[PDB]
């Protein structure tokens, strides 16, 4: 057996849910860096 | 067989992937960063562009360096033959020592051959020194390919 706590199925759920959470953190850091061009909305 | 376990092709296909991905990463840095400097002098003296395509060609050779060792690792991988863990560790190491070799050589060619091409529009006598520094920065991947070929022939 691989382990009793860190079994064959838990340890490859925590790789899938680490890859997906990595893609999520990257995509949320893309959307967090999204700013509005305010000079093209004002009168000045 | 205790010397040839069934997880050994993991480290051989990892050697294939490290030999291809990092070498084409180095080749892409070397062609993109240098194409920035070649296209930057596109208006100022356009006649020096077709002479300055050498750091793009020498960057593209770094992908051939990874292609050769990726073919030679993938030719030693079959599901019917026995495949030792020694062979898998050796293919991991020979892909890993050519991938970062071509990556560093591509970073060096990209940083040299755009500054050189970008200063070459002022001084037309730079070209021999530019080609010389590109040869010294392109043998960096040839060293890693030599180590990878010797290591492939040793590990099989």
């Amino acid at each position: 057996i691989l382990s009793s706590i860190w079994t064959e199925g838990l340890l490859m759920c925590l790789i899938v849910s680490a890859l997906l959470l990595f893609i999520l953190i990257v995509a949320l850091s893309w959307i967090s860096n999204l700013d509005i061009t305010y000079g093209a909305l004002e009168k000045s | 067989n205790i010397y040839a376990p069934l997880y050994a092709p993991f480290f051989g296909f990892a050697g294939c992937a490290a030999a291809m991905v990092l070498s084409c990463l180095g080749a892409a840095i070397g062609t993109a960063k240098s194409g920035i400097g070649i296209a930057g002098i596109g208006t100022f003296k356009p006649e020096l562009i077709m002479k300055s395509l050498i750091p793009v060609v020498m960057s593209g050779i770094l992908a051939i360096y990874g292609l050769v060792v990726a073919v030679l690792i993938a030719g030693n991988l079959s599901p019917t033959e026995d495949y030792t863990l020694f062979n898998g560790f050796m293919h991991l190491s020979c892909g890993l020592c050519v991938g970062f070799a071509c990556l560093s050589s591509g970073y060096a060619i990209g940083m040299v051959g755009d500054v050189g091409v970008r200063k070459y529009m002022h001084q037309p006598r730079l070209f021999v020194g530019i080609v010389l520094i590109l040869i010294f920065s392109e043998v960096l991947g040839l060293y890693g390919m030599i180590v990878a070929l010797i290591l492939n022939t040793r590990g099989s």
């Binding site: - | 069934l6 296909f13 992937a17 991905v21 062609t31 070649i38 296209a39 356009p46 599901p79």
Partner: protein
């Protein structure tokens, strides 16, 4: 804060490895048994999905790099906005590379019998499809970004002078060698891999 987590995970890995090694149980951190006992369908499906995912995240990367500068450079010189679309095309072909490799890989994806499930060949064709999906998706990623950068420079040098696009299309050719080389290597890696049996 991310450097704090990078240091904390490193400290926890070193403390766990040295605790497991000092107490005579250091072979319990067993990466080989992890590779032997995880399902080959994880590696196969993950390789297929990351192949077609990372080809597209490089294709779409290059498309906006040489699209936004094409539209910016086309404001004064609008006679580039159709001729220079081959720079979109050269960074778009790295997605059809990953697509036609992902379908060829998914042809090797059948139901294996449970009595021969963690066999030599079934585990081989999980490893091969995993790394041959990685080496195609990452190569098409890097090729799409490089062709996008060398097309963004070409879209502005085209609007500068018309005779420069022919000279800087060659750099896009040498940049688009890379995705085709990844296309070759990912077919050679999963060339001897059989189906799941």
């Amino acid at each position: 804060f991310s450097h704090f987590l990078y240091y904390l995970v490193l400290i926890v890995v070193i403390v766990y490895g040295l605790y497991k090694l000092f107490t005579g149980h250091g072979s319990d951190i067993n990466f080989g048994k992890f590779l032997l006992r995880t399902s080959p369908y994880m590696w196969a499906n993950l390789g297929i999905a990351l192949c077609v995912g990372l080809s597209v995240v490089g294709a779409a990367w290059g498309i906006f790099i040489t699209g936004s500068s094409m539209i910016g450079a086309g404001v004064r010189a609008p006679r580039i906005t159709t001729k220079n679309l081959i720079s979109i095309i050269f960074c778009e072909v790295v997605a059809i590379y990953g697509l036609i490799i992902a379908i060829v890989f998914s042809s090797k994806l059948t139901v294996a019998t449970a009595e021969n499930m963690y066999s030599k060949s079934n585990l081989y064709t999980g490893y091969s499809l995993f790394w041959a999906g990685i080496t195609v998706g990452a190569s098409n990623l890097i090729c799409g970004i490089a062709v996008g950068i060398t097309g963004a420079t070409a879209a502005i040098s085209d609007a500068a002078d018309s005779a420069l696009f022919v000279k800087i299309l060659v750099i896009e050719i040498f940049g688009s060698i890379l995705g085709l080389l990844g296309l070759i290597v990912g077919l050679l890696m999963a060339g001897k891999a059989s189906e799941f049996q």
